[PDB]
Amino acid sequence: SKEYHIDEEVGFALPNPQENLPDFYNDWMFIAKHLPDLIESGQLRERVEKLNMLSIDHLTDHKSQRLARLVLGCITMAYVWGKGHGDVRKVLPRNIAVPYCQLSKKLELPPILVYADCVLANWKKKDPNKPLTYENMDVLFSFRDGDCSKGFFLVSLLVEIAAASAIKVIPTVFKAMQMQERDTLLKALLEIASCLEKALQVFHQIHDHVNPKAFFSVLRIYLSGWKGNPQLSDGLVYEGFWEDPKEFAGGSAGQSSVFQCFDVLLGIQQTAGGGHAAQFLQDMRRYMPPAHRNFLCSLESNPSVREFVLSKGDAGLREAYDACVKALVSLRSYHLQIVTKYILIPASQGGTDLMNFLKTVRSTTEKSLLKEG
Amino acid sequence: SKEYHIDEEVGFALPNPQENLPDFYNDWMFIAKHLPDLIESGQLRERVEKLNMLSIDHLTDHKSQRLARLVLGCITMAYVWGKGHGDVRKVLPRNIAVPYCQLSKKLELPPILVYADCVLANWKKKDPNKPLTYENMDVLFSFRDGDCSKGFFLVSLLVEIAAASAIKVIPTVFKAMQMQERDTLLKALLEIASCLEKALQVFHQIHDHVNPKAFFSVLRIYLSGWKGNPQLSDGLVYEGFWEDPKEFAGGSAGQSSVFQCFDVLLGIQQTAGGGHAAQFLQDMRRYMPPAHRNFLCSLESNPSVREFVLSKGDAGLREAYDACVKALVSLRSYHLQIVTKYILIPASQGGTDLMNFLKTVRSTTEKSLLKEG
Ligand code: HEM
Ligand code: HEM
Ligand SMILES: Cc1ccc(-c2csc3ncc(C(=O)NCCc4cccc(Cl)c4)n23)cc1
Ligand SMILES: Cc1ccc(-c2csc3ncc(C(=O)NCCc4cccc(Cl)c4)n23)cc1
Numbered sequence: 001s002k003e004y005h006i007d008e009e010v011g012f013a014l015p016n017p018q019e020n021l022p023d024f025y026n027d028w029m030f031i032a033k034h035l036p037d038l039i040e041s042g043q044l045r046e047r048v049e050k051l052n053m054l055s056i057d058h059l060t061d062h063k064s065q066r067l068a069r070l071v072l073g074c075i076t077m078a079y080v081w082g083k084g085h086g087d088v089r090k091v092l093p094r095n096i097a098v099p100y101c102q103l104s105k106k107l108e109l110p111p112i113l114v115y116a117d118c119v120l121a122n123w124k125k126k127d128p129n130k131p132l133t134y135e136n137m138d139v140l141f142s143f144r145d146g147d148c149s150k151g152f153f154l155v156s157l158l159v160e161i162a163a164a165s166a167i168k169v170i171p172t173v174f175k176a177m178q179m180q181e182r183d184t185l186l187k188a189l190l191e192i193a194s195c196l197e198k199a200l201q202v203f204h205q206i207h208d209h210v211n212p213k214a215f216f217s218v219l220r221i222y223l224s225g226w227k228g229n230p231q232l233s234d235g236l237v238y239e240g241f242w243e244d245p246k247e248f249a250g251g252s253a254g255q256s257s258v259f260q261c262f263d264v265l266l267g268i269q270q271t272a273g274g275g276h277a278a279q280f281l282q283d284m285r286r287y288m289p290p291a292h293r294n295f296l297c298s299l300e301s302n303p304s305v306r307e308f309v310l311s312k313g314d315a316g317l318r319e320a321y322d323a324c325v326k327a328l329v330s331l332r333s334y335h336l337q338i339v340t341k342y343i344l345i346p347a348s349q350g351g352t353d354l355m356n357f358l359k360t361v362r363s364t365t366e367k368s369l370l371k372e373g
Numbered sequence: 374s375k376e377y378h379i380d381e382e383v384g385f386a387l388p389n390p391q392e393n394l395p396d397f398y399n400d401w402m403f404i405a406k407h408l409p410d411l412i413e414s415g416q417l418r419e420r421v422e423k424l425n426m427l428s429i430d431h432l433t434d435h436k437s438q439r440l441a442r443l444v445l446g447c448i449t450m451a452y453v454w455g456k457g458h459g460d461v462r463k464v465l466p467r468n469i470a471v472p473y474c475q476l477s478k479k480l481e482l483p484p485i486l487v488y489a490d491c492v493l494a495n496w497k498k499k500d501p502n503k504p505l506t507y508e509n510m511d512v513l514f515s516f517r518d519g520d521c522s523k524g525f526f527l528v529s530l531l532v533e534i535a536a537a538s539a540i541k542v543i544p545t546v547f548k549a550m551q552m553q554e555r556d557t558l559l560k561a562l563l564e565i566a567s568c569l570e571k572a573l574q575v576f577h578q579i580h581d582h583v584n585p586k587a588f589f590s591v592l593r594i595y596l597s598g599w600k601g602n603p604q605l606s607d608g609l610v611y612e613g614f615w616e617d618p619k620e621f622a623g624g625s626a627g628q629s630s631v632f633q634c635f636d637v638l639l640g641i642q643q644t645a646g647g648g649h650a651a652q653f654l655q656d657m658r659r660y661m662p663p664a665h666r667n668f669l670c671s672l673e674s675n676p677s678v679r680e681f682v683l684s685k686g687d688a689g690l691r692e693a694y695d696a697c698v699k700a701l702v703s704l705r706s707y708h709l710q711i712v713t714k715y716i717l718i719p720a721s722q723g724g725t726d727l728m729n730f731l732k733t734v735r736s737t738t739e740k741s742l743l744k745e746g
Contacts, residue, residue, distance in 0.1 A: 003674070110647035248647055271659060273483075273619030274600070274608075286647045286655065294673055301667040 001171065004295040010132070011164025012257040012292055013120040013157060018063040019140050021071065025058065027051055032071040035078050036145045045089070048079050053095045056103045065103055066121050067140075072100040073113030074141050077222045080236060084144075084221040088231045094240035101241040108290040111238060112225055112248040115255035116289050119153045120160065132161055134206055144218040151209025152219065155202070156253065162202045163258040166195035170265065174302050182314060189305075189320035196262065196327035203334055216346035225250025254284040257292040259328075264299045266324055267306030268368045277360040306368070318370045325368050332362040374544065377668040383505070384537020385630045385665060386530060387494040391436040392513065398432065398441065400425050405444040409518045412451055418462065421452050426468040429475045438476055439494045445473045446486035447514050450595045453609060457517075457591035461604055467613040474614045481663035484611060485598055485621040488628035489662050492526045492533070505534060507579055516595045521584035525592070528576075528583050529626065535575035536631045539568030543638060543672070550681050555690065558681075562693035569635070569700030573707060580711060588716045598623025627657040630665045637672045639697055640679030641741045643734060650733050679741065691743045698741050705735040 001008075007015040021029050031038060031047050038044035059065040075096060080089050092100075097111070104111035122140050130136040134154055142149040169188050176185035211217070226232035227247035235247035254260075260281065263270045272278045285293045309321045336358050343351050374381075380388045394402045404411065404420060411417040432438040448469065453462050465473075470484075477484040495513050503509050507527060515522035542565050549558035584590070599605035600622040608620030627633070633654060636643045644655040658666045682694045709731050716724065 105646070108642070108645050246648065273611075273615060273617075274621065275617070275619070282659075283647075283652050283656070286645075286652060290645070294670065297666075297670040298674060301670055 001167075003291065004298070005289065005291040006167055006295065007164070008168065009164070010161050011167055012116075013123070013160055013164075014063070014066060014116075016063075017121050017123060017140070018067045019124050021064060021067060022058050025054060025068065025071075028054065028068075028071050028075070031078075032074050032141060035074060035141065035143055036147075039078055039083060039144060042083075044078055045082065048075060048096060049093055051093070051095045054099055056099050056106070059103065065107060066117065068103055069100075069107060069109065070113075070117045070121050070141060072096065072103070073117055074143070076100060076111075077113050078143065080226070080232075081221055081224065084218055086231075090232055090245070091237045091239055097238035098240045101238050110248045110287055111246075112287075113223065113251065114287045115251060115253055116287070116292070118223070118251065119156050119256075122153055123157055132158070134158060134209070143222040146211070147217055147219040147222075148210050148214050149219055151206075152214065155206045155209060156256070158202045158206060159199050160256060160258050162199035163196065163262075165198060166192040166262070169195070170299075173265070173305060177303065177305065177308055182312070182317065186314075186316055186320045189317070189324060192262075192265075193320070193323035193327045196324060196331065200327070200330055200334060203331065203338075207338060210342075212342065213346055215342050215351075216348075223251030249284070249287065252280075252284060254281050255287045257288055257296065259331075260285070260296055261299065262324070262328065263365075264296060265305060266321070266328070266368065267304045268325070268328070269364050272364060275360070277357060277364070280357070281361070310370075322370050325365065325370075328365045329362060329369075332358070332365055336362060374541070376664065377671075378662065378664040379537075379540055379668065381541065384534055384540055385489075385493055385662075386496075386533060386537075387436065387439055389436070390494050390496055390513070391440045392497055394437060394440055394444065395431050395433075398427055398444075400427060401441075401444050401448070405447055405514055408447060408451055409515055409520075412456060412517060415456070417451050418455065421448065421469060422466055424466070424468045427472060429472050429479070432476070438480060441476055442480060442482065443486075443490050443494050443514065445469065445476065446490045447516065447595075449473065449484075450486050450597075451516060453599075453605075454591075454594050454597065457594040463605060463607075463618065464610040464612055470611040471613045474611050483621045483660055484619075485660075486596070486624060487660050488529075488624055488626060489630075489660075489665075491624070492529050493662075495526055496530055505531070507531065507582055517591050519584075519590075520592050520595075521587035521590045522592065524582040524584055525587055528579050529629075531579060532572055532576050533629060533631055535572035536568065536635075538571065539565045540631070540634070542568065543634075546638070546678060547675050550676060550678065555685070555687065559690050559693045562678075562690070562697060565635075565638075566693065566696035566700045569697065569704055573700070573704045576704070576707060583711075583715075585715065586719065589719065596624040622656070622660065625653075625657055627654050628660045630661050630669065633658065634669055634672060635697075635701055636738070637669055638678060639694070639701065639741060640677045641698075641701075641738055643737060650730055653730070654734075682743070688744075695743050698738060698743075702735065702738050705731070705738060709735060 006012060009015065028051070031044065031051075035044070038047055056065070056068065059068050076092060079092065079096070082089065101111045109116070123137055124140060125132065125137050127136060137154060139150045139153050169192050172188045173185060173192070176188055214220075225248055226235045226245075227249040229250075232245070235245035237245045260270070270278050270281055285296060288296070305321070309317050339355070339358060343355060379385060404417070408417070411420060429438075429441075432441045449465060452465070452469075455461065474484045482489070491514065497511055497513060498505070498509055499511055500509055510527055512523050512526050542561050545561040546558060546565070549555075549561060597604075598621055599608035600620045602608075602623070607618040610618040633643070635641075643651065645651060658669060661669070678694070682690050712728070712731060717728065
């Protein structure tokens, strides 16, 4: 762990995200901040075309250009979708698309808003001395008023932070596998399982901050993409950067590195002969920061912990490994239970495909256990 | 150069491939060796459907179970595509599917024939002592008679080898970036550039040995997979193993580890952007020997050569870099020249999707140049 951009406190989240851009990009910042207003009042799209072409070079360091990608991503989502009710836009203005794509190419990310810049790069502590707890922090950007995006992004971010506690351990696991020290390894697996169960609570204790009208709410349509989307059948033209419409997938927490990482570590079959599930999740790595998608790979570069633990005929080891897998099914489940409270409930007078997707992943997790319970 | 299985003399190719399996696997070694005979006669699908389900216990050392993969592989393509005319099989026999997937999950490869299978692990020396040259060499397997097998696989392999002479220069490039030895880098870069030049020269001098009407021969039908293939809507069933029909891509020379690794090294980033071709080559990585994707990624873990050369304001070093890109572009252009000559022209008396895919891969290589202003 050196140049994988995994922070030891906040994990895959961008630590202390920059919340102010150079004055040069104030018009960008303005539209972005006042997203909820500009949309409902209708002038957003106008205020977007009002923008002249700005160069991205004044974005000197990593963090600033990161905030830029957030600012522009939102602006883009706001522009494409508008009030969200159906008035789409098939062409993104050159004075936005060109900077967006240039910077997007630079940071190695598709020119669409992703989990990495919408959750992990979209936050700040209120009082910089009080710890990272919900009541001490806030988002930087939301789409419309009462979309609960504050709570949605913040909790996910909090679960993301909570998982970092286990990342620290990973080298210990691979090292303890190499030098062949059962006791250290077993010890370390329990510690991971311990941290993954710690993540369950931040999920439990903090599920209070999303309103049952959040899917059916204005969100979800703002995180919608233009890949296989009937509304932009062929994708969005990024005017002055691409002669042709390009398709990019929308938002999915499949772009959260955390869960993929431990899916990999524990050898949970996430390539399992393809299938929408394992395949989707894979090509969702293309939407992760180049350093994180790189860390993921690197884990598979390492030998399987699952193949090791099997072969040792070690009861305490299996249980320890099972304890981690149990921790994931627990996580996936409470997530799934929370999801059903949000899809067949606000289906009141497409949403069942997701229900399957979740369940196939969770199932692949469950089938990984070594004691059937 | 460590645990990546990159032979000093033969690159990514299997060091010295095993010709004969263990005595046990003779029910297989027979079929595959007499495979052209058995397709035309229309007895292949039958002989396979009446076969002993030999267990994978007796194939042990690396060279053997890779030969096993090749054998089982061709057999599977023969059994699915039949004569190459219409008639198709959607299910693979328990007796041959199960030991194949047992060996596939074992060797961490997908249960389809691969470039690594039928090019890297498919050859021999007629005269064991003398150099690796065309006439000195012959393949181990084929599908039909005059089906263009030898030349295609052999020329590929010979270019793959020719290119490998550079893989050994890779560590220096990263050492010279670390120790910061400007001269050493420039030198090592010119050498890599020259290795690519030499491989194009090899391509020139042996291009003929590939049969002029190879694309249209049954070959392409036998190298067809079951991923986004209309003919196998849901993909092949490996029954006994997985109850569901599973989905895997047919052979593409985008599984050639060398070409991808020079893309990576020079920072051509074919694997970035999330676009159609971007996601493809990234997915083809899963169809490479495990030892090999790891190496590809290691390269990706390392600092960017392109970045380093851009930063230094060093025209000599810039030039030596371009030399490499030009050399990789030349390599691709000549390839595209012969692809046009073999596939476009004879179409008259998908054919475009292929031409487009190659062109972008070439274009995004040509675009990686430096000295432009
Ligand atoms: C509380 C409101 C939430 C709802 C309604 C919700 C809904 C969903 C839905 C519908 C999917 C499948 C569609 C997709 O993203 O591809 C999903 C996937 C996912 N969600 Fe959430 N989610 C919520 C909160 C969270 C939180 C707090 C986390 C933790 C960071 C999380 C992590 C994930 C992950 C990792 C996936 C990918 C599926 C997997 O790996 O199993 N979600 N979510
Ligand atoms: C002259 C006979 C050949 C023909 C007709 C031919 C045709 C093609 C076609 C149609 C593709 C795109 C389909 C795909 O693989 O996804 C392709 C890709 C490719 N071919 Fe060939 N090929 C030939 C010989 C070679 C040889 C000898 C090599 C050297 C190993 C080579 C290396 C590649 C590579 C690396 C790709 C991936 C795309 C790229 O890197 O630009 N080909 N070839
Ligand atoms: C840019 C971005 C990406 C992922 C997340 C995120 C964090 S936690 C989580 N679970 C699911 C998602 C997600 O965005 N999925 C798409 C569908 C969907 C989106 C929002 C609400 C609903 Cl109800 C359904 N997500 C947040 C932002
Ligand atoms: C399993 C396997 C994979 C790749 C190769 C190979 C080595 S060099 C090269 N160029 C293209 C390919 C290739 O097979 N691509 C598929 C399209 C195609 C192109 C030309 C002729 C035909 Cl018959 C088919 N290829 C050989 C075996």
